[PDB]
């Protein structure tokens, strides 16, 4: 065994939300939980996620980490679970992903309304006056 | 195995070419002698946020074409860009999109 | 509380997603899927009280596919023992498992 | 947790009165180490030595109760030879409450703890005869 | 449930605590939240993935995206407050009162 | 006595058929002339908070004050009613078909029961 | 604000409560409250001050943590079981999670702090708003798995609610506080029969909403938040004085008042199970709530309290908006109680 | 009419990207619900095997149902042949 | 609970097909074409069994099959068929269109020497019928008997007797 890569990735999770728990300069917490992100996306692609994990890579860190930095700048065991048969000729995780429109209309009109309810209460907080 | 090695020589590279451009002009002796807080900046980062949001859900549309159910696909997708455009109408008619 | 609005329209708004047996995409199967299968005709109309406390056995296997604790258990024990008796040179691999024997496709 | 809930109640009420004095300051020293944690979180004195202090001072507070009580019942049950009486427990909440005023140094707070702890205790004792429950099971 | 669940949840509970400390900073408040949901996506993901359930791989990103929104929201909350103060900072947040 | 579960309850109906089944209260119930009193009161109060003569003030907002109320308790008492019906059937149901649990207690007289006897002195 | 913006804002609220009410999955439940949480805060920042920036954002932080530890029993709860109805947990941890998360989001003692300052913070159609739609969801969701709740949990956080809710609102002449107050004593009377019957809970939380609603549009019509202010509204509205008098003497459990009912109805059920004592100590707490209910009463209706001189200029105008449901709020929250075997209808 | 047709006139003037944006978002919206091709678009993706096709059991009723491939019973794929 | 039994090693023993997944790519279609019973037979008896254990001798007999039909190419076209497979096994993503030339001649060498055609598109994707004398298993799932369902009660509604029977109301 590779001494458990994802139970050293899990170890280095941990430690990184340790870091960042402390709450030293609110810089140095992002930049924890940026590396908390980039190992648990480690964690997720080792696993199999691999379009889970690039979301999280994607959204997650080049939005929000991005806005919460941005924002911030402004002011002052393993290996046992796994299976035994294929996937066939395509991947599960996609074709689930894929599924949501099929199958998911209700979390697509009900996740859409909130976008747009979002969009508008942030501009609304921000109106000032 | 191979993309975490590309990533370590990378990385390694980089490394190591910063510190040797960083410490070759450090062996010679040489001399060696606010508030404001704008808040246009702070909405367009929301609203890229925001935008980013909607990306994700789409990321999905290149499988979702695939399923046999090809009109509720096209509707739900068609829905989501709709609501999309919908959002950036309302940021645009309420000067959210000015400096 | 509850207002089973789906059950009086017959909508099906959010039951497609709540079970691992339930018509996934191409078929795919769960892997605890005929565990659940199991459970879940045991504890039909049976009521949640009766469903506890009679169809335990089925929940168990359903639980144990989930988790495998057990299956985690009897393995552990195995290589621990394996181990105690490489280590006191009384036991010694096959040939099989020290990667000398011939693959089959 | 009802392991020190355990410990005290398995010892007989008329028997072995140091380990049921044990008992009891066990579970006063825990209750004052929460009621110094509560204290500390919504009331942050000064520093971290004061701090620390207070919570010694309700700790040894609330065991010392816990002990003069358990010891007071107890040997209070063993000489007057009768069990299972709401008496005895009601004497070691008089001395639970006495041990309470000394700390305060207050005569009126002594005296006022005394009467309600005795009467705390014995209603104790009498649920415990009774099979009253403080927390009862959905029956019907 | 083995080690690297045990290992996610603790990470969850070390963001909890972090969070509930409230030293100050509530910039540091929201980091902790999303640290929070952050484990919360790693686990759900490592769940569905391991017990090959195909429909839930829905719900991780669904997940995020809300949690996303709320993170926005939070944000505009956090510099408005700095709007009145010029700072950040959680113990100027005490004009409200038990 | 929770019913939310009882089988063949379909979800949202207020009254279900077979509660057809089942006498209707009649109109002068003393029941629904307390919602049609209630309709009054709040008919008065309305007045009262509109700073107008209170007594004589809409003859037809009270009126419409005492119908509403007056509709309305008619259907909540035919609810109510339904359901304790539903209480006494299921009831009724239980013990018949569970005898061991609900056996007969012997008939016994007081000339030979035997009761402890307290004088007050 | 816009008041299209205003009225979209309100509906997202209720389509939230509403998704939480009518789903059986826990992910869309989540949903819900998500929508609900991103509706609810422009409505409390309607009015721009630095009080309610400062109570939306403790509203916020609350919320937001609450819904974190929900979903954290939620995932636990699949783990243990790949389930995702609302249905028993079947999980000891995953419940504790779930009690703890509802509790942060009814304002249930320990997790009361946020309801007196929110509350105080926001304005009075916003706390009447916070006080009465907010309870629906998260009540709805305790009702739906009562029967895995442990009844100790739920008993020792429901007494601690009342005990908490008695004490606080003894050391208050703020109206909002009050109220805030007064909410916390009546969710610890809601919750604490949970355990045994859903009905009766559903009962207490109807009866409630009526005496909340008619408080609140009693003190919205007498524009009041202090004592004092309330104590010069006599002089001009002595009606408007006596209904809320009787109102209060309602919220204060007294019989023949409508909020007699719940409490009676309670601690009948209570009794059913063999449970003396509790109710026995929420009784008695409940007096400290009808105290300081006495005490507003004797401040506003049944003394005399001085006034000012240009209180004069406001005997020549009167209302130009009222509240049409008023009335009947004041007559449903007074005058309800020889109705009371109506709870039959599973309200 | 002649007011829409002003309109129309004014925007495509001074505004040409949004008159197109939203020509081409309408043209995407209502065209699919009228071309005969999407019929064929989801037949081509029924007739896309991904999963083993399950033999069933003979029971001795069932003609329609092919014993082999080659047999003349059963779905054919001219029509995505020619097209 | 109970003793998981396995079969011997030497129920195991099979003579096996051992051509690379380029030939393999290569005959596939003339493979569906004509070892298609046995392979149907099994497939049949592998989901209705739900278990390896159950449906050894099938996989026993297409093997053989398998075999029988590469000793068939054997004998009569190697040569076309080993130019073929060569650029099957060429191409990474092992594409049918990158040599259609040499799948020409391997095409009109079968049927000359075999009278093999090359099934259709849309042929080798259809279902199918078996006809099988394997009894159709009768509990596959091996579950037990479903617990007995709740009396379901059913009678005419009466009025409930003396009213509510709440405290003093007499309705
Ligand atoms: C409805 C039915 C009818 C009902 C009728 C009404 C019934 C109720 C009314 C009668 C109640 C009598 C008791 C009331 C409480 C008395 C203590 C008190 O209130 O403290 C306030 C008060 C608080 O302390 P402080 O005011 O800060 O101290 C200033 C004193 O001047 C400092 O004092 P000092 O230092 O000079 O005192 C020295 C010495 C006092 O000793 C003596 O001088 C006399 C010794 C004999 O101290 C002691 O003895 C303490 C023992 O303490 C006192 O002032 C008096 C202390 C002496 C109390 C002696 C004991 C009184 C009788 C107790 C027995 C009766 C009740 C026992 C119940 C136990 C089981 C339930
Ligand atoms: C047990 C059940 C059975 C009994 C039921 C009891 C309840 C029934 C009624 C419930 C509510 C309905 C009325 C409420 C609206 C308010 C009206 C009002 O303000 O009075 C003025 C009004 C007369 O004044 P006005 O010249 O028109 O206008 C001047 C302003 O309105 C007023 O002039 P102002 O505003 O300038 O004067 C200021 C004054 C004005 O402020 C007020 O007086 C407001 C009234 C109190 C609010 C009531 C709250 C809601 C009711 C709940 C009651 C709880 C009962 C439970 C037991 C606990 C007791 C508290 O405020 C004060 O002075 C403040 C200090 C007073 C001391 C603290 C207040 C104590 C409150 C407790 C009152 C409870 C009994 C009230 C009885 C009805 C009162 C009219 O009174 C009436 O005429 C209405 C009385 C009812 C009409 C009956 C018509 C039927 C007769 C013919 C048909 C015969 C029937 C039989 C058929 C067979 C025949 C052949
Ligand atoms: C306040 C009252 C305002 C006026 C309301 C008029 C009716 C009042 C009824 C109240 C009770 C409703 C009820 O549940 O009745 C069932 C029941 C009486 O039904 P029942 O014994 O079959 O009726 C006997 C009649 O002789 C049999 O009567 P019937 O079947 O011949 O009915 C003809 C109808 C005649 O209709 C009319 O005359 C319409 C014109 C008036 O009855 C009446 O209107 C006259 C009464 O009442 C009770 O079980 C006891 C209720 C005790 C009071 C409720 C519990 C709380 C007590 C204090 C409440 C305080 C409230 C806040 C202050
Ligand atoms: C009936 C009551 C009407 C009034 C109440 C409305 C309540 C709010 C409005 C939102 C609810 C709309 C209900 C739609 C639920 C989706 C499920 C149902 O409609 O069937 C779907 C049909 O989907 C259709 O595309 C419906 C399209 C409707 C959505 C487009 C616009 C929705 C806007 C509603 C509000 C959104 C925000 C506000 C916009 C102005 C599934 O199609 P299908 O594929 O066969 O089945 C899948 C199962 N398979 C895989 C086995 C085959
Ligand atoms: C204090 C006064 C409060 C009054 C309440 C407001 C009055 C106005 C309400 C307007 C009419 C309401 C009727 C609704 C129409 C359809 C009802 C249907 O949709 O719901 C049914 C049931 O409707 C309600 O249960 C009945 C509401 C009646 C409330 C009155 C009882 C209040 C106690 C007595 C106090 C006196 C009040 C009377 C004076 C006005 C089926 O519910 P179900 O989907 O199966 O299960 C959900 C409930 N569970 C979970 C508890 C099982
Ligand atoms: C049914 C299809 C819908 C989906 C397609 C749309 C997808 C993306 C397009 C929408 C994005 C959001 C649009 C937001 C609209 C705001 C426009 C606006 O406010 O701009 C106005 C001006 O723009 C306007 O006039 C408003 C819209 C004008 C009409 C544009 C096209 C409308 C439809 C035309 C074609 C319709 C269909 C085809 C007809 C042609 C024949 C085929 C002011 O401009 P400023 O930059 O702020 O300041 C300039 C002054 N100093």
């Keep these: 065994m590779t001494m458990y890569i994802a139970f050293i990735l899990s170890t280095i999770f941990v430690i990184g939300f340790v870091g960042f728990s402390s709450k030293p300069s609110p810089i140095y917490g992002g930049l924890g939980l940026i590396v908390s992100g980039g190992v648990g996306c480690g964690i997720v692609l080792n696993f199999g996620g691999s379009f889970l994990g690039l979301m999280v890579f994607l959204i997650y860190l080049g939005g929000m980490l991005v806005v919460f930095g941005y924002t911030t700048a402004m002011a002052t065991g393993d290996w046992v679970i796994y299976d035994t048969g294929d996937s066939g000729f395509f991947s599960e995780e996609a074709m689930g992903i894929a599924a949501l429109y099929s199958y998911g209309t209700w979390l697509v009109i009900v996740t859409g309304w909130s976008l747009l309810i979002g969009v508008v209460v942030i501009m609304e907080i921000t109106r000032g006056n | 195995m191979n993309i975490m090695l590309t990533l370590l020589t990378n990385v390694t590279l980089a490394s190591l070419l910063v510190l040797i451009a960083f410490w070759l002009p450090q062996l010679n002796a040489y001399s060696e002698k606010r508030l404001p807080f704008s808040m246009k900046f702070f909405l367009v980062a929301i609203t890229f946020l925001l935008f980013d949001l909607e990306i994700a859900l789409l990321l999905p549309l290149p499988w979702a074409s695939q399923t046999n159910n090809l009109k509720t696909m096209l509707t739900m997708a068609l829905f989501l860009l709709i609501l999309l455009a919908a959002s950036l109408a309302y940021e645009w008619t309420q000067k959210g999109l000015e400096w | 509380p509850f207002f089973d609005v789906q059950k009086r329209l017959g909508l099906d708004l959010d039951r497609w997603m709540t079970i691992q047996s339930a018509e996934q995409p191409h078929k795919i199967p769960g892997r605890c899927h005929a565990f659940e299968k199991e459970w879940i005709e045991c504890a039909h109309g049976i009521g949640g009280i009766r469903a506890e406390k009679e169809c335990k056995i089925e929940f168990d296997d359903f639980v144990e596919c989930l988790l495998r604790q057990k299956t985690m258990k009897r393995l552990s024990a195995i290589k621990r023992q394996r181990d105690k008796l490489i280590k006191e040179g009384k036991y010694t691999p096959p040939p099989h498992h020290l990667g000398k024997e011939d693959p089959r496709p | 947790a009802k392991t020190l809930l355990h410990k005290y109640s398995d010892i007989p009420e008329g028997t072995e009165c140091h380990r049921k004095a044990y008992a009891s300051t066990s579970i006063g020293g825990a209750t004052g180490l929460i009621v110094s944690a509560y204290s500390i979180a919504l009331k942050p004195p000064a520093s971290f030595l004061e701090g620390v202090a207070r919570t010694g001072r309700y700790t040894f507070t609330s065991a010392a109760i816990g002990a003069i009580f358990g010891l007071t019942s107890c040997i209070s049950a063993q000489v007057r030879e009768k069990p299972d009486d709401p008496l005895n427990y009601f004497i070691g909440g008089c001395a639970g409450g006495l041990t309470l005023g000394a700390r305060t140094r207050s005569y009126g707070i002594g005296a006022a703890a005394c009467a309600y702890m005795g009467l705390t205790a014995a209603l104790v004792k009498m649920g415990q005869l009774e099979g009253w429950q403080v927390f009862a099971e959905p029956k019907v | ?98 | 006595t929770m019913m939310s579960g009882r089988p063949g309850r379909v979800p949202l109906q207020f009254l279900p058929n077979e509660a057809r089944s089942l006498p209707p209260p009649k109109l002068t119930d003393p029941r629904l002339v307390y919602m049609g009193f209630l309709g009054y009161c709040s008919g008065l109060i309305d007045n009262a908070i509109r700073r107008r003569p209170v007594v004589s003030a809409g003859l037809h907002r009270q009126l419409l004050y005492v119908t509403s109320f007056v509709f309305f308790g008619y259907y909540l008492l035919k609810r109510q009613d339904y359901m304790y019906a539903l209480r006494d059937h299921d009831m009724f149901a239980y013990v018949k078909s569970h005898p061991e649990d609900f056996p007969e207690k012997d008939k016994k007289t007081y000339g030979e029961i035997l009761e402890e006897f307290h004088p007050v002195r | 604000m816009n008041p299209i913006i205003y009225t979209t804002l309100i509906m997202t609220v209720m389509s939230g409560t509403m998704l939480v009410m009518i789903s059986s999955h826990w992910l869309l439940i989540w949903i819900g409250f998500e929508m609900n949480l991103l509706a609810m805060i422009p409505v409390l920042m309607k009015n721009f001050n630095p009080r309610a920036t400062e109570a939306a954002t403790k509203y916020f932080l609350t919320q937001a943590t609450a819904s974190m530890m929900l979903m954290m029993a939620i995932i636990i709860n699949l783990l243990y079981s790949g389930q995702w109805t609302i249905t028993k947990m079947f999980n000891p941890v995953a419940m504790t999670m779930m009690t703890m998360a509802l509790a942060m989001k009814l304002g249930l003692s320990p997790f009361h702090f946020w309801v007196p300052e929110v509350t105080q913070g926001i304005s009075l159609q916003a706390g009447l708003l916070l006080l009465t739609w907010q309870k629906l969801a998260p009540l709805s969701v305790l009702c739906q798995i009562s029967q895995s709740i442990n009844p100790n949990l739920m008993l020792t956080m429901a007494m601690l609610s009342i005990l908490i809710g008695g004490w606080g609102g003894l050391n208050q002449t703020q109206l909002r506080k009050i109220m805030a107050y007064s909410s916390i004593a009546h969710m610890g009377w809601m919750t604490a029969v949970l355990p045994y019957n859903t009905t009766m809970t559903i009962l207490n939380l109807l009866i409630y909403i009526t005496m909340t609603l008619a408080m609140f549009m009693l003190l919205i019509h007498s524009s009041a938040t202090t004592t004092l202010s309330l104590s010069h509204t006599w002089n001009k509205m002595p009606v408007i004085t006596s209904l809320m008098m009787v109102t209060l003497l309602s919220m204060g459990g007294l019989p023949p008042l409508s909020g007699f009912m719940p409490k009676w109805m309670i601690i009948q059920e209570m009794t059913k199970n063999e449970s003396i004592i509790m109710p026995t100590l929420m009784a008695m707490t409940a007096l400290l709530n009808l105290y300081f209910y006495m005490r507003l009463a004797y401040s506003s209706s049944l003394t005399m309290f001085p006034s000012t001189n240009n209180m004069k200029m406001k005997w020549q105008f009167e209302h130009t908006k009222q509240m049409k449901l008023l009335p009947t709020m004041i007559v449903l929250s007074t005058l309800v109680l020889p109705m009371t075997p109506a709870l039959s209808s599973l309200n | 009419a002649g007011r829409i047709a002003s309109f129309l006139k004014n925007a495509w003037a001074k505004e040409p990207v949004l008159v197109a944006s939203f020509a081409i978002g309408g043209l995407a919206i209502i065209l699919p619900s009228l071309s005969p091709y999407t019929n064929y678009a989801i037949r081509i993706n029924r007739a896309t095997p991904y999963n083993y096709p399950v033999p069933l059991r003979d029971d001795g009723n069932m003609p329609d149902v092919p014993s082999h491939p080659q047999d003349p019973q059963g779905p054919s794929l001219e029509w995505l042949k020619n097209l | 609970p109970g003793i998981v039994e396995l079969p011997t090693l030497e129920d195991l023993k099979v003579q096996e097909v051992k051509v690379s997944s380029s030939v393999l790519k290569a005959a596939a279609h003339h493979y569906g074409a004509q070892c298609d019973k046995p392979n149907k037979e099994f497939m049949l008896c592998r989901w209705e069994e739900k278990d390896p254990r159950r449906c050894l001798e099938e996989g026993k007999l297409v093997n053989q099959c398998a075999l029988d039909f590469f000793r068939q190419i054997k004998r009569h076209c190697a040569e076309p068929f080993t130019e073929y497979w060569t650029c099957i096994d060429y191409s990474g993503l092992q594409l049918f269109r990158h040599c259609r030339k040499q799948q020409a001649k391997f095409d009109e060498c079968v049927l000359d020497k075999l009278g093999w055609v090359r099934p259709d598109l849309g042929e080798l994707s259809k279902v199918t019928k078996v006809k099988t004398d394997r009894p159709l298993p009768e509990n596959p799932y091996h579950s037990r008997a479903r617990p007995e369902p709740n009396p379901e009660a059913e009678g005419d509604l009466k009025p409930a007797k003396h009213g509510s029977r709440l405290f003093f109301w007499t309705m």
């Design chain 5, 1 to 98: 449930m083995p080690l690297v669940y045990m290992n996610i949840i603790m990470a969850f509970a070390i963001a909890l605590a972090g969070l509930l400390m409230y030293r100050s900073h509530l910039m540091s408040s929201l980091l902790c939240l999303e640290g929070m949901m952050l484990s919360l996506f790693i686990m759900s993901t490592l769940i569905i993935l391991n017990t090959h359930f195909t429909l839930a791989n829905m719900m991780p990103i669904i997940l995020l995206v809300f949690a996303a929104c709320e993170a926005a929201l939070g944000l505009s909350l956090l510099v408005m407050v700095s709007n009145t103060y010029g700072t950040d900072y959680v113990q100027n947040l005490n004009l409200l009162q038990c």
